[PDB]
């Protein structure tokens, strides 16, 4: 009950400020036709628009409270998003006339509720055009209902802006109805800039001051900032304006700092160094899919340099694989990485510590010093027709680290993914060109998991890279820029940040094909396997296995051809001998992601 008073106050004042985003989903739909439909309801004449010209500020005196409206660009999708993410309640426009086109207008309502959506309403401004009889209008009304609940059976009734009841319903929802809180959007900060000025300190650097009140979390000085499309940058001084306090960047201020300083490598040793007449085979345990696995050896080149850094296992979920272990192949940054422990315990801390030491709380009036370079203000556009957005970043989170993403391909999403192609992912309202190895989600005790070479369609599969953390396990997206599609982007897949942790170990499979073709009694010869005695001679140790379901060993060398003799539990010239080997799969660093 105490609660409920504490909740309202911040917007049911002479102070407050809600967000509302007109995202009209079809082509032959005005969004300024939606917001006079929707400012008519409204007493104030000297409310109406005309002419700042997206972002506005209007204060409706019928309810005692201020609106904050926002008008997306819709040649632009991302930017479309990007104004949703930040809304407090999203108006969804539909139109009576004109379908609502699958491959964009659909595709929005998609990827809105998918990267997460505060509050949602149904509106009609197009009923008009229909026809004259209100008989064959509501036929229409109650189709375009049928189509809204089918996405999300939150809202039962699509309001129709033609009628003054429907449309005083609307702004009585838009102004006293608290809106939904959208869980990595609060639990960080983030301020929607009224005014945006400069200061100039340095002929490189300045300040960029950013105006606007305070939602989510808050503000700390030492704390990073994100401006999308721009980057991570940090305060030098935040101002606080109170109706009848200005904190200042300490010491202990964050470090843009992507990797751990260089030299951090050789103060560890957590390596497990490894020294061979066999090649190396590890039975630790007890004993389509086999057709991307699979590789040919060339005849000129030898097995024993090629497959070097390749071990035999006896089993993939009990082999004592080792992280951080001495390999050439690892990358540079590896050791220069955050290595978080346990990521569960260290997410709940960060985000209790941000809360708890928050300088400038949700509803006040802030003057943001962010140190901006002079060079990037030719980019920004004008914060009344452009969402120039600022949302605070937690401890850390600029650091990159081994991250993991849950992903599930887009719905009708047919087209094949490969794991190492560079794909966009947009995990809360940063973005970055990842490439990501896939691995199949699974309970294994070693923390070891078999590197998918392209995305499983039937279930969700786990991404693995080299990105900065996200301590909010925001959702994420995962989109490919096309220039032949409606919208500049081409979605992949949608999901969730798992975690970070380097702890993960991925192997890649490599299953050496062979062909018998001389029998006697025990000794089975194969021949299509290696191409040099001295290469039989080395993965002797590692068994062999038959697509028919046997299981076998390497005997000896028969000629200088690669050709040799085997032993077998049960085959014949039909069958297919084969050899399996794993490597380790280190992630892969990742760039931002801007324009």
Same mark, same amino acid.
């Given at each position: 009950?105490?609660?409920?008073?504490?909740?309202?106050?911040?917007?049911?004042?002479?102070?407050?400020?809600?967000?509302?985003?007109?995202?009209?989903?079809?082509?032959?739909?005005?969004?300024?036709?939606?917001?006079?439909?929707?400012?008519?309801?409204?007493?104030?004449?000297?409310?109406?628009?005309?002419?700042?010209?997206?972002?506005?500020?209007?204060?409706?005196?019928?309810?005692?409270?201020?609106?904050?409206?926002?008008?997306?660009? !819709?040649?632009?999708?991302?930017?479309?998003?990007?104004?949703?993410?930040?809304?407090?309640?999203?108006?969804?426009?539909?139109?009576?006339?004109?379908?609502?086109?699958?491959?964009?207008?659909?595709?929005?309502?998609?990827?809105?509720?998918?990267?997460?959506?505060?509050?949602?309403?149904?509106?009609?401004?197009?009923?008009?055009?229909?026809?004259?009889?209100?008989?064959?209008?509501?036929?229409?009304?109650?189709?375009?209902?049928?189509?809204?609940?089918?996405?999300?059976?939150?809202?039962?009734?699509?309001?129709?802006?033609?009628?003054?009841?429907?449309?005083?319903?609307?702004?009585?929802?838009?102004?006293?109805?608290?809106?939904?809180?959208?869980?990595?959007?609060?639990?960080?900060?983030?301020?929607?800039?009224?005014?945006?000025?400069?200061?100039?300190?340095?002929?490189?650097?300045?300040?960029?001051?950013?105006?606007?009140?305070?939602?989510?979390?808050?503000?700390?000085?030492?704390?990073?900032?994100?401006?999308?499309?721009?980057?991570?940058?940090?305060?030098?001084?935040?101002?606080?304006?109170?109706?009848?306090?200005?904190?200042?960047?300490?010491?202990?201020?964050?470090?843009?700092?992507?990797?751990?300083?260089? /030299?951090?490598?050789?103060?560890?040793?957590?390596?497990?160094?490894?020294?061979?007449?066999?090649?190396?085979?590890?039975?630790?345990?007890?004993?389509?899919?086999?057709?991307?696995?699979?590789?040919?050896?060339?005849?000129?080149?030898?097995?024993?340099?090629?497959?070097?850094?390749?071990?035999?296992?006896?089993?993939?979920?009990?082999?004592?694989?080792?992280?951080?272990?001495?390999?050439?192949?690892?990358?540079?940054?590896?050791?220069?990485?955050?290595?978080?422990?346990?990521?569960?315990?260290?997410?709940?801390?960060?985000?209790?510590?941000?809360?708890?030491?928050?300088?400038?709380?949700?509803?006040?009036?802030?003057?943001?010093?962010?140190?901006?370079?002079?060079?990037?203000?030719?980019?920004?556009?004008?914060?009344?027709?452009?969402?120039?957005?600022?949302?605070?970043?937690?401890?850390?989170?600029?650091?990159?680290?081994?991250?993991?993403?849950?992903?599930?391909?887009?719905?009708?999403?047919?087209?094949?993914?490969?794991?190492?192609?560079?794909?966009?992912?947009?995990?809360?309202?940063?973005?970055?060109?990842?490439?990501?190895?896939?691995?199949?989600?699974?309970?294994?005790?070693?923390?070891?998991?078999?590197?998918?070479?392209?995305?499983?369609?039937?279930?969700?599969?786990?991404?693995?890279?080299?990105?900065?953390?996200?301590?909010?396990?925001?959702?994420?997206?995962?989109?490919?820029?096309?220039?032949?599609?409606?919208?500049?982007?081409?979605?992949?897949?949608?999901?969730?940040?798992?975690?970070?942790?380097?702890?993960?170990?991925?192997?890649?499979?490599?299953?050496?094909?062979?062909?018998?073709?001389?029998?006697?009694?025990?000794?089975?010869?194969?021949?299509?396997?290696?191409?040099?005695?001295?290469?039989?001679?080395?993965?002797?140790?590692?068994?062999?296995?038959?697509?028919?379901?046997?299981? /076998?060993?390497?005997?000896?060398?028969?000629?200088?051809?690669?050709?040799?003799?085997?032993?077998?539990?049960?085959?014949?010239?039909?069958?297919?001998?084969?050899?399996?080997?794993?490597?380790? !799969?280190?992630? !892969?660093?990742?760039?931002?992601?801007?324009?």
């Amino acid at each position: 009950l105490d609660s409920i008073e504490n909740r309202k106050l911040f917007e049911g004042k002479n102070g407050a400020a809600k967000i509302i985003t007109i995202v009209p989903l079809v082509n032959d739909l005005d969004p300024l036709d939606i917001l006079y439909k929707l400012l008519k309801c409204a007493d104030d004449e000297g409310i109406m628009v005309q002419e700042s010209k997206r972002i506005f500020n209007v204060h409706i005196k019928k309810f005692k409270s201020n609106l904050k409206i926002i008008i997306p660009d !819709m040649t632009n999708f991302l930017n479309i998003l990007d104004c949703a993410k930040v809304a407090d309640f999203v108006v969804f426009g539909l139109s009576g006339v004109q379908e609502v086109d699958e491959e964009f207008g659909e595709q929005i309502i998609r990827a809105l509720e998918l990267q997460g959506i505060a509050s949602y309403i149904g509106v009609i401004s197009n009923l008009s055009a229909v026809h004259e009889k209100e008989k064959f209008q509501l036929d229409v009304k109650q189709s375009l209902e049928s189509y809204f609940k089918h996405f999300f059976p939150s809202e039962e009734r699509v309001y129709n802006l033609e009628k003054n009841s429907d449309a005083l319903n609307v702004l009585r929802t838009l102004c006293q109805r608290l809106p939904r809180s959208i869980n990595w959007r609060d639990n960080r900060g983030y301020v929607v800039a009224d005014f945006v000025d400069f200061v100039e300190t340095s002929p490189d650097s300045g300040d960029l001051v950013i105006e606007g009140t305070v939602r989510g979390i808050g503000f700390n000085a030492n704390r990073l900032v994100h401006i999308p499309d721009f980057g991570d940058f940090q305060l030098n001084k935040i101002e606080k304006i109170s109706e009848s306090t200005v904190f200042e960047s300490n010491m202990n201020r964050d470090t843009l700092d992507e990797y751990a300083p260089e /030299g951090t490598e050789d103060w560890s040793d957590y390596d497990e160094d490894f020294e061979l007449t066999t090649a190396r085979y590890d039975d630790h345990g007890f004993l389509d899919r086999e057709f991307p696995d699979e590789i040919e050896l060339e005849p000129s080149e030898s097995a024993i340099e090629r497959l070097k850094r390749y071990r035999g296992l006896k089993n993939l979920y009990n082999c004592d694989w080792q992280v951080d272990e001495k390999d050439p192949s690892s990358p540079a940054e590896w050791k220069r990485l955050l290595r978080i422990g346990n990521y569960k315990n260290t997410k709940n801390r960060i985000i209790k510590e941000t809360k708890n030491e928050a300088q400038a709380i949700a509803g006040d009036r802030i003057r943001m010093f962010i140190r901006f370079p002079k060079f990037l203000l030719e980019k920004i556009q004008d914060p009344k027709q452009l969402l120039f957005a600022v949302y605070g970043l937690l401890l850390h989170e600029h650091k990159n680290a081994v991250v993991n993403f849950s992903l599930q391909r887009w719905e009708q999403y047919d087209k094949p993914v490969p794991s190492q192609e560079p794909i966009v992912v947009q995990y809360g309202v940063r973005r970055y060109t990842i490439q990501p190895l896939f691995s199949q989600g699974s309970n294994s005790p070693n923390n070891v998991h078999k590197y998918e070479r392209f995305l499983h369609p039937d279930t969700v599969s786990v991404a693995t890279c080299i990105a900065p953390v996200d301590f909010t396990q925001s959702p994420a997206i995962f989109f490919k820029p096309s220039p032949t599609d409606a919208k500049n982007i081409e979605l992949i897949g949608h999901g969730t940040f798992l975690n970070a942790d380097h702890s993960r170990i991925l192997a890649k499979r490599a299953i050496l094909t062979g062909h018998p073709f001389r029998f006697h009694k025990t000794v089975v010869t194969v021949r299509y396997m290696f191409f040099r005695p001295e290469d039989v001679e080395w993965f002797k140790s590692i068994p062999l296995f038959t697509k028919s379901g046997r299981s /076998g060993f390497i005997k000896e060398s028969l000629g200088t051809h690669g050709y040799f003799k085997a032993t077998f539990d049960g085959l014949s010239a039909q069958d297919v001998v084969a050899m399996s080997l794993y490597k380790r !799969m280190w992630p !892969m660093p990742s760039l931002p992601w801007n324009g």
